[PDB]
């Protein structure tokens, strides 16, 4: 069904499709094989539908969490990179594309949460979560606030909760243990206790959400906020003298934000696997290809070191990379729908006061 002799790549509309087109033009100049770059609407649902029928693009770009389900459905072909190319990428990035003990896709870009602070209102951001109450009181003495972020999202509340050993699913030897869940362990209990203490001590509002936090930060009413690279354009438009650093530690342990890795998968029914692998290894995942794609649309942290130390000159990119390295890699199995539901319910119950921290975490675990 997929035509041989050419490469078809599907990418999301918010990524660097023009840069991908330029890389494909370089590939066709080098080898004589044309490359087609498209950004179909509703890609997340369109790709599995066409892949289940033996059709679709030769190469697919999406976050690694759905690639596990795609490989479970058999829609992704196994890649065979040599040790020379494997050493060019980070070990945790390689871990991001491992399912059933076999590599299924090529990491491209790494995204994770980071601490965003106002330089004018706070030249030195705190390195620990315990300093936040004192800093917030000091700023309230000047009629301001220190830090407020999205408390309605488990993705945002996880870094504080899972700082001291909390984890979603146990990961050992390239396999995730579903029956082993650390939602209600000592570290997560301590993190959620600290969060609810911050809420109760009027340091943060339990009803604060993404819109309120973003507006408060871009209006200069806050000193710190927690957000990903996607808001950097918004703060740049708001012209706030902002800085990005590592997330504060809890009890001496670094925060563990969820890590999302953009990766390059190969269709199982695609008959152009050899040329797709060659293109990915020698033309796309190179300094020139990454810089072209970043020039089109920024990617933040990248899997390649040859471009990662190049992008490290940006403090925001360096902070995002170190936060991703220190954080928890997002697994790729379907039961995190239930995981998100349970953690969200536990967080809402703990913040709203209907249930205690221990009861909420026990309910989330069960």
């Amino acid at each position, epitope marked *: 069904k997929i035509e041989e002799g050419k490469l078809v790549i599907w990418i999301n509309g918010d990524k660097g499709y023009n840069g991908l087109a330029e890389v494909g033009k370089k590939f066709e100049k080098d080898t004589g094989i044309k490359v087609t770059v498209e950004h179909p609407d509703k890609l997340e649902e369109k790709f599995p539908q066409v892949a289940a029928t033996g059709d679709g693009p030769d190469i697919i770009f999406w976050a690694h969490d759905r690639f596990g389900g795609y490989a479970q459905s058999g829609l992704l072909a196994e890649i065979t990179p040599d040790k020379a190319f494997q050493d060019k990428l980070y070990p945790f990035t390689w871990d991001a594309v491992r399912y059933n003990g076999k590599l299924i896709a090529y990491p491209i870009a790494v995204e994770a949460l980071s601490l965003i602070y106002n330089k004018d209102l706070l030249p030195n951001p705190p390195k620990t979560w315990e300093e936040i109450p004192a800093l917030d009181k000091e700023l309230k003495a000047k009629g301001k606030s220190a830090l407020m972020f999205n408390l*309605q999202e488990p*993705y945002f509340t996880w870094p504080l909760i899972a700082a001291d050993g909390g984890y979603a699913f146990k990961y050992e030897n390239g396999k995730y243990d579903i029956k082993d869940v650390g939602v209600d362990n000592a570290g997560a209990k301590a993190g959620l206790t600290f969060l609810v203490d911050l809420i109760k001590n009027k340091h943060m509002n339990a009803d604060t959400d993404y819109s309120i936090a973003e507006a408060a930060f871009n209006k200069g009413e806050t000193a710190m906020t927690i957000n990903g690279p996607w808001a950097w354009s918004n703060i740049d438009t708001s012209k706030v003298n902002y800085g990005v650093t590592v997330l504060p530690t809890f009890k001496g342990q670094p925060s563990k934000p969820f890590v999302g890795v953009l990766s390059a998968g190969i269709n199982a029914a695609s008959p152009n696997k050899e040329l797709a692998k060659e293109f990915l290894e020698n033309y796309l995942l190179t300094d020139e290809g990454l810089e072209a794609v970043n020039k089109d649309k920024p990617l933040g942290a990248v899997a390649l070191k040859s471009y990662e130390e190049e992008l490290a000159k940006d403090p925001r990119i360096a902070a995002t990379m170190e936060n991703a390295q220190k954080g928890e890699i997002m697994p790729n199995i379907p039961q995190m729908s239930a995981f998100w*539901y349970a953690v969200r319910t536990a967080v809402i119950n703990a913040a709203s006061g209907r249930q205690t921290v221990d009861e909420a975490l026990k309910d989330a675990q069960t």
Partner: nanobody
Amino acid sequence: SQVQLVENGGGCVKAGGSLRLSCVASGDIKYISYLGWFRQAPGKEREGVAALYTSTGRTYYADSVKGRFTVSLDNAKNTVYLQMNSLKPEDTALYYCAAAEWGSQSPLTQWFYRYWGQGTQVMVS
């Protein structure tokens, strides 16, 4: 695709009129926590018009439609509605229905949601 969204209720309405839209979600939709509505004029970027948080009932509205649109979800019918009151000619576009289990960005972004519907067309003269 176990989650499907179907839109209807779009009609030809004069300026200042009132219209209502419906979006029915079918399948395994127990894990969906965000319901959002998007409109896309022909040849224009898809813009967020409303968003709903199922867990707590929190609603989100854009600046251009704040105080004019009302979005609500019926749990007993698994259908989300949006009330289009005080219409203006600028409101004509192809209205889409979106749903997502979770997200890391603002709920008014098209990339926030994973499930998308076919869309309905509303014209205001």
